[PDB]
Every structure is written in structure tokens, then in C-alpha cells.
Amino acid sequence: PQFGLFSKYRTPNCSQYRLPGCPRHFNPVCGSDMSTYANECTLCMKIREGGHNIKIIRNGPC
Numbered sequence: 001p002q003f004g005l006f007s008k009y010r011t012p013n014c015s016q017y018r019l020p021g022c023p024r025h026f027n028p029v030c031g032s033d034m035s036t037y038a039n040e041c042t043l044c045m046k047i048r049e050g051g052h053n054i055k056i057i058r059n060g061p062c
Helices: 043-050
Strands: 056-058
Touching: none
Parallel strands: none
Antiparallel strands: none
16 A cells, blocks of 8 residues: 555545635545545645644545
């Protein structure tokens, strides 16, 4: 897999979602910070400093 998940946890790759804002609502991933999310306003907001450096708990549906 990509790097693994045993180091911290498995961190999401938000190298996209590059909107001036955030369209739609959809939450693919699962948050270690107790937030089911995935987008520019959910993670990428969080991830840059909306929460932490997010590690999703689950990389997919929950």
C-alpha cells in the first residue's frame, strides 16, 4: 500500500479538492477526530488546521 497505516495511522492525500470553495456534500472517509468527512471543507479545511493533520480512521465508507 502507500507507505502503510502503522505509522500514526493512514493519512489522506488531499492533493485535490482544489476549489475556491466547496461544492456538494459527501463524506467518504472517516475521521480519527470523530468526524465522518472528505472534501475541501471537511478534511482539507480540517487538515490544514481545521483540526489537526487529519488521519482518517477509515479510508473509506463507515
